Design a protein around this ligand. Structure first.
Ligand SMILES: Nc1nc2c(ncn2[C@@H]2O[C@H](COP(=O)(O)OP(=O)(O)OP(=O)(O)O)[C@@H](O)[C@H]2O)c(=O)[nH]1
Ligand SMILES: [Zn+2]
Ligand SMILES: [Zn+2]
Ligand SMILES: [Zn+2]
Ligand SMILES: [Zn+2]
Lengths: 55, 50, 46, 49, 65, 1097
RNA sequence: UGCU
């Protein structure tokens, strides 16, 4: 729900490469910004399977 | 096989023998067009073997 | 709803439902394209 | 100078990506090194016992 | 791909003369006298018609059909 | 009395290209690898058996590769085309089969056909489906006839194996050491081991160093150990010159200082000095016989040849210790080019050895303790091992051969489909063994040895300048021969056996050594007769035309090279100031009576190697032929490569200009092939109205680039206009751009996969979510069809889904979550086609072909086929564009200020030639070192009525008054590049950040921000904008508020210090997230930073 | 891998 008006019309609309869950009634920004990884960072995370990580 | 945009550009490059003095400029918008300031040309060609 | 497709070599209109092995009759080619839409599209001559 | 306890950092330094496309995840090298250290400690304890 | 309708520099209608130029080529007319008979005085249209490559048939040979 | 010149001489190049040239090299190499080398490897590894349970064996009889097939059908093979492979993202390989015979229970059982793997088949190969096909069949199979081919197709991507350039093996190299000690080295490489042994004079005496010895030992001890114990004989072998003896004296003294005088003592010393892997004596003898100098064979522990070899090496070292005659590594006469054939042969041999070892291990583990049921190999014959090995080696590009200890990277690269010229130029590239190890500048410099072999001007501009090269228009790479008849002829021509005479004869001035592939073949006298007879026999044909023979007088050594990988070039034989080829022969060739093979057989044209032309004399033209000439140059313009062949009149421009022109032609925009519409790639650029150049070169006519041009000819006027063409920029015409000039099409591919997981569940495409309010699909699912897949013909906007894919989360009712393929794009795109294929894994692959028709605008880059790259500065209307008396307005206006500093007279010559051609209805030639002269085009202009200098009377369009100076108008072939301002434009808002460090991402595709590097930080510091630097590097990048405890100085959380279990001394503080991460990493490393806070006052 |  919206913290200002209490409406449940929360839509995820990316505004110029900016992911943002904003209400569709009053435009109140609920949440903004997402943490992704970066390529060198992706490169350096190594792939480990569940067969080994789970136990 | 010709692209839609290339075909539209080639068709736009084709001149029309209509007299421009008898027509007027289309106002801002109004994509439907009016009888005074629009001309319609249909092109329907279906190629088939002889 | 009858979903229609076109073969890569026979170019024949084939009707297949969902979750079917992609194939075409009177041949064995496994390339199936989708026909062009019927909706009205507006283009600009610019 | 002689260490008897290793300081495992928080997860902010060890980012983990949940790759749902396969049965595995992308983990950094520090996590694997700490896992190997714990395994070696357990093996040493088993041999001592 | 296909002969353009308008010329880049001036803009004279040249797409309608492509088949005529091909006919002149099939005939005994050379490039120079063919372009001269087609009515192209300025060299822009001559270049447009001479430097053009006909690939529409090469693409239709691959078209679905 | 001028020497007569054969005008049709250039007709020898098309005939040569009919059977060789640009792409035939890799095709022939792959054909040989799959026809002879694979059979030889199978014969070498024909028998494999296990130690346990004797009388059991697995014998291979004959291996086949068969035709390319696809394993899609249910245990059924079906011919598959390369285009179908590209579309379905599979590999274009053929099933490798073999017939074998084994013993299950002592009863011999044979198999006539058993698959063991799959070998990726190269296109246009012997077994490929494209070879021996007409253009009609190519069209039926959806393949371009002009496609060069010769590349592999694996998983849908086109990979090309570049030609590796390394140093020649089994050759002595005398060079300076690190500190500067002139020593020698030799890398003996046989079919099994490769060992590099060196010899240094660090302390006036010759110490030999090998990787298997603890410490370098004197050479006299090795002499005494190899059988020759007489110091007199050793000195006679080293040399009889006064300076030679004076330089070798110290070695004899150091040897006499010790008590080593017999072979037994020398071998004992060597054994004591040998590293761990009389027993020591046996190991020393074994290392001296096999390990050291593997290329020098010993009949039966007879080290005479090896002694003579080391003596010749020491003699060369002594001779080099005086006059600084140091050999250079960049001399391509000692280089070898390994094509894809040798690489694939080595890889297949390694994989077959691994498979044999695995089979032997499985047998040893199964047969002795399984059961009375007799075990056979068929039940464990892995058929996917070789397939996966080849697939990975071709895709990843990293080759790791443990049997040879070879770890190479970047062997395979993605074939650049930017244009036909780009592909044809990338197919003929050459990578070096250095691979950007040091900025030596030596191998990067252009050596005179590249004459006629590699293109001097074609080189990528950047960090890889000098290391990546392209072959010339006319060249060939030799293969390996049997070397039997060569040795036979050498022995019959009077070559004395080296074992018959002592080494004293090696010091004579008239006695010349003769070497065969690094091995001492013997000695000879009057080497002129030997060389003449060998060349005459090779021309007659009894010796392979590719066997090279060179003579070096400084060392008195005649080398006979017969190994593969050597670069050769055809040359016309000249005898007594008259070439052998005549007008009659050229007329016969033109009419079809003879061919290039007939010319080779009739002793008219012959292949020369680098080392052979080093001694032979060549003539450029007929008028240059003098009394001392042995060969004649076929054509000078062949010196340039494929990419450089497009340059019209290149000998009138500068070298950097040609380099930039080739670099930009490798990216030029244009048509790819006749199947470019059915081709679906991740990124393709096409031109609307491509036109062939007016000034086309003979190289263009040969490569058939006129059929697939990559540019348009526009009426360019060289002048300054509006000052929007200050620095290399150009002004375009609005009306020209509106009439279709420069129109480009960008085709992108969006692929989606619907695969089945382990559980009996599959990803499904949901229908369009219709809005109950309007009973129509929502704006996001508006372009979707009834099946949830976007239909062709419509336009796609930003943040719109193409495939409403939903995948299960379990891998009781399945729970599907949506993961649609959204379209990220600033501009709209139109869907041309939607292909749906099904793989063998029941996976549905959906590929939608997005198209974007873009118009030339401000910021687009353009080239003029002369390296005069520019950017669109302004687009002025036609009424603003000037006009001449005829009324022609220029489409492009370039800056004349770029001509003085760049000396691009070739551009002016091309413009004048194109003007004359468009006026007279002809096509002038800009062939290098020739072509149409300026006088002919001036005559054409003055005949047609235009100025004989290109400059014409032009009137200003703005003011309407004539200009005081004439403008230089003419048709120039401008080509548009892939660099688009629409794609290079970027603007980053807050956007996302990285998980590890809370900072913007790197790439634009991932919505990355710019980087204020160390240089930017230094500039800001120099300016002194402290608040600006702070707002940039702290506030707007990684701003964060942490909690620090004023008691212990550690980092807290939520205003609480877990260390002291208190919250009275905890306070907030602004700090970069990167600095906080650094503090955390240091605390983990046990370097605890204790922060002592204080008031800001 | 390309670009400046
Ligand atoms: N398009 C592109 N291709 C690359 C890039 N980097 C590497 N490649 C491919 O990899 C080869 C050389 O890259 P390298 O510099 O060896 O890769 P690297 O040494 O790891 O470079 P770093 O990642 O900076 O260390 C080239 O010949 C390419 O085959 C790149 O940054 N962009
Ligand atoms: Zn709200
Ligand atoms: Zn069909
Ligand atoms: Zn014109
Ligand atoms: Zn504290």
């Amino acid at each position: 729900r919206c913290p200002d008006c209490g409406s449940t019309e929360l839509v995820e609309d990316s505004h110029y490469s900016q992911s943002q869950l904003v209400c569709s009634d009053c435009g109140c920004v609920v949440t903004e910004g997402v943490l992704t990884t970066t390529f060198s960072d992706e490169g350096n995370l190594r792939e480990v399977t569940y067969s080994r990580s789970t136990g | 096989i010709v692209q839609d945009e290339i075909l539209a550009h080639r068709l736009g490059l084709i001149p029309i023998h209509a007299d421009p003095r008898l027509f007027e400029y289309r106002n801002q918008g109004d994509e439907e067009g009016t009888e005074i300031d629009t001309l319609q040309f249909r092109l329907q060609v279906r190629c088939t073997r002889n | 709803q009858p979903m229609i497709y076109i073969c890569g070599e026979c170019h024949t209109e084939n009707e297949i439902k969902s979750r079917d092995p992609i194939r075409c009759r009177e041949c064995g080619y496994r390339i199936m394209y989708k026909k062009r839409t019927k909706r009205l599209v507006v283009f600009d001559a610019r | 100078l002689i260490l008897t306890r290793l300081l495992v950092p928080p997860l902010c330094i060890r980012p983990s990506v949940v790759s749902d496309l396969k049965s595995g995840t992308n983990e950094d090298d520090l996590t694997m090194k700490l896992t190997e250290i714990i395994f070696l400690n357990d093996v040493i304890k088993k041999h001592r016992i | 791909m296909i002969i353009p309708v308008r010329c880049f520099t001036c803009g004279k209608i040249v797409g309608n003369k492509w088949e005529a130029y091909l006919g002149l080529l099939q005939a005994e007319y050379t490039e120079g006298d063919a372009l001269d008979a087609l009515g192209l005085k300025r060299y822009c249209c001559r270049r447009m018609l001479l430097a053009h490559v006909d690939l529409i048939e090469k693409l239709l040979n691959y078209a679905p059909l | 009395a001028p020497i007569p010149t054969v005008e049709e001489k250039w007709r020898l190049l098309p005939a040569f290209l009919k059977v060789k040239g640009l792409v035939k090299q890799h095709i022939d190499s792959f054909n040989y690898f799959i026809n002879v080398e694979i059979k030889k490897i199978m014969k070498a590894n024909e028998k494999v058996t296990s130690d346990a349970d004797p009388m059991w064996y697995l014998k291979y009889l004959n291996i086949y590769v068969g035709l390319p097939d696809v394993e899609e059908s249910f245990n059924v093979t079906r011919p598959v085309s390369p285009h179908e492979c590209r579309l379905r993202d599979m590999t274009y390989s053929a099933p490798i089969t073999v017939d074998i015979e084994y013993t299950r229970g002592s009863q011999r059982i044979i198999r006539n056909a058993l698959p063991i793997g799959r070998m990726p088949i190269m296109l246009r190969s012997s077994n490929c489906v494209l070879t021996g096909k007409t253009p009609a069949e190519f069209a039926k199979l959806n393949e371009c006839p002009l496609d060069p081919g010769g590349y592999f197709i694996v998983k849908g991507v086109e990979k090309v194996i570049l030609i590796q350039e390394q140093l020649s093996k089994n050759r002595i190299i005398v060079e300076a050491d690190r500190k500067g000690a002139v020593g020698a080295s030799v890398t003996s490489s046989t079919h099994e081991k490769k060992s590099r042994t060196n010899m240094a004079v660090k302390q006036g005496r010759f110490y030999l160093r090998h990787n298997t010895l603890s410490e370098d030992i004197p050479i006299v001890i090795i002499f005494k150990a190899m059988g020759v114990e007489s110091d007199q004989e050793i000195v006679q072998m080293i040399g009889t010159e006064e300076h030679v003896m004076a330089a070798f004296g110290p070695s004899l003294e150091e040897c006499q200082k010790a008590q080593i005088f017999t072979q037994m003592q020398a071998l004992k010393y060597i054994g004591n000095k040998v590293r761990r892997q009389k027993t020591k004596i046996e190991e020393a003898r074994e290392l001296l016989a096999s390990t050291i100098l593997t290329h020098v064979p010993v009949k039966e522990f007879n080290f005479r040849a090896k002694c003579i070899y080391t003596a010749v090496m020491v003699r060369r070292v002594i001779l080099a210790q005086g006059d600084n005659k140091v050999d250079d590594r960049d001399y391509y006469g000692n280089k070898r080019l390994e094509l894809a054939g040798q690489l694939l042969s080595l890889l297949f041999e390694d994989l077959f050895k691994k498979f044999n070892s695995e089979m032997k291990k499985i047998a040893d583990q199964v047969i002795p303790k399984q059961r009375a049921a007799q075990f056979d190999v068929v039940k464990h014959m892995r058929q996917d091992q070789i397939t996966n090995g080849m697939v990975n080696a071709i895709s990843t590009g990293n080759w790791s051969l443990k049997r040879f200890k070879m770890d190479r990277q970047g062997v395979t690269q993605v074939l650049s489909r930017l244009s036909y010229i780009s592909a044809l130029g990338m197919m003929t590239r050459i990578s070096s063994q250095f691979e950007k190890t040091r900025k030596v500048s030596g191998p990067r410099s252009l050596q005179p040895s590249q004459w006629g072999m590699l293109c001097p001007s074609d080189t990528p501009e950047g960090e890889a300048c000098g290391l990546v090269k392209n072959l010339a228009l006319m060249t060939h790479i030799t293969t390996d021969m049997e070397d039997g008849p060569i040795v036979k002829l050498a022995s019959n021509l009077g070559v004395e056996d080296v074992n018959l005479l002592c080494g004293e004869e090696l010091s004579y001035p008239n006695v010349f050594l003769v070497f065969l592939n690094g091995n001492i073949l013997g000695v000879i006298r009057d080497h002129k007769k030997l060389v003449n007879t060998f060349r005459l026999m090779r021309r007659a044909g009894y010796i392979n035309e590719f066997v090279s023979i060179s003579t070096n007088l400084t060392d008195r050594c005649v080398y006979i090279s017969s190994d593969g990988g050597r670069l050769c070039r055809p040359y016309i034989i000249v005898k007594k100031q008259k070439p052998a080829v005549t007008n009659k022969h050229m007329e016969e060739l033109a009419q079809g009576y003879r061919n290039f093979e007939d010319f080779l057989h009739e002793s008219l044209v012959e292949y020369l190697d680098v080392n052979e032309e080093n001694d032979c004399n060549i003539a450029l033209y007929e008028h240059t032929i003098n009394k001392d000439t042995t060969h004649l140059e076929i054509e000078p313009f062949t010196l340039l490569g494929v990419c450089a062949g497009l340059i019209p009149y290149p000998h009138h421009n500068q070298s950097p200009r040609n380099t930039y022109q080739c670099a930009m032609g490798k990216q030029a925009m244009g048509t790819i092939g006749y199947n470019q519409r059915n081709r679906i790639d991740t990124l393709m650029y096409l031109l609307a109205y491509p036109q062939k150049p007016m000034v086309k070169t003979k190289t263009i006519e040969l490569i058939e680039f006129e059929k697939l041009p990559a540019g348009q000819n526009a009426t360019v006027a060289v002048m300054s206009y509006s000052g929007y063409d200050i620095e290399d920029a150009l002004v375009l015409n609005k009306a020209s751009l509106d009439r279709g000039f420069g129109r480009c099409l960008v085709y992108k591919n969006a692929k989606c996969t619907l695969k089945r997981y382990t559980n009996q569940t599959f990803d499904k495409v949901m229908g369009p979510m219709l809005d109950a309010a309007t009973r129509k699909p929502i704006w996001r699912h508006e372009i979707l069809d009834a099946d949830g897949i976007c239909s062709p013909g419509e336009k796609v906007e930003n943040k719109q889904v193409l495939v409403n894919k939903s995948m299960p989360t379990v891998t009781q009712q399945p729970q599907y979550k949506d993961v649609p393929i959204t379209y990220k794009g600033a501009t709209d795109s139109y869907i041309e086609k939607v292909m749906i294929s099904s793989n063998a894994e029941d996976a549905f692959l959906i590929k939608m072909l997005l198209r974007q028709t873009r118009r030339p605008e401000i910021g687009d880059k353009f080239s003029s086929r002369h390296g005069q790259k520019g950017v669109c500065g302004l687009i002025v209307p036609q009424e603003d564009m000037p006009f001449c008396d005829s009324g022609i307005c220029p489409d492009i206006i370039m800056n004349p200020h770029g001509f003085p500093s760049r000396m691009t007279v070739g551009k002016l010559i091309e413009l004048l030639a194109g003007k004359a051609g468009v006026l007279d209805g002809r096509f002038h030639y800009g062939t290098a070192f020739g072509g149409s002269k300026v006088k002919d085009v001036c005559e054409d202009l003055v005949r047609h009525g235009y100025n004989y200098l290109g400059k014409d009377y032009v009137t200003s369009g703005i003011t309407g008054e004539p200009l005081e100076a004439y403008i230089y108008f003419g048709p120039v072939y401008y080509q548009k590049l892939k660099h688009m301002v629409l794609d290079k434009m970027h603007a980053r808002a807050r956007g996302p950040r990285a998980v590890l460090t809370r900072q913007p991402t790197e790439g634009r595709s991932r919505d990355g921000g710019l980087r204020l590097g160390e240089m930017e930080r230094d500039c800001l510091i120099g300016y002194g904008a402290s608040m600006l630097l702070l707002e940039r590097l702290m506030i707007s990048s990684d701003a964060f508020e942490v909690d620090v405890c004023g008691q212990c100085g550690l980092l807290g959380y939520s205003g609480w210090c877990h260390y002291c279990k208190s919250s009275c001394h905890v306070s907030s503080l602004r700090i970069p997230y990167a600095c906080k991460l650094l503090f955390q990493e240091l605390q983990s490393m046990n370097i605890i930073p204790r922060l002592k806070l204080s008031k800001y006052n």
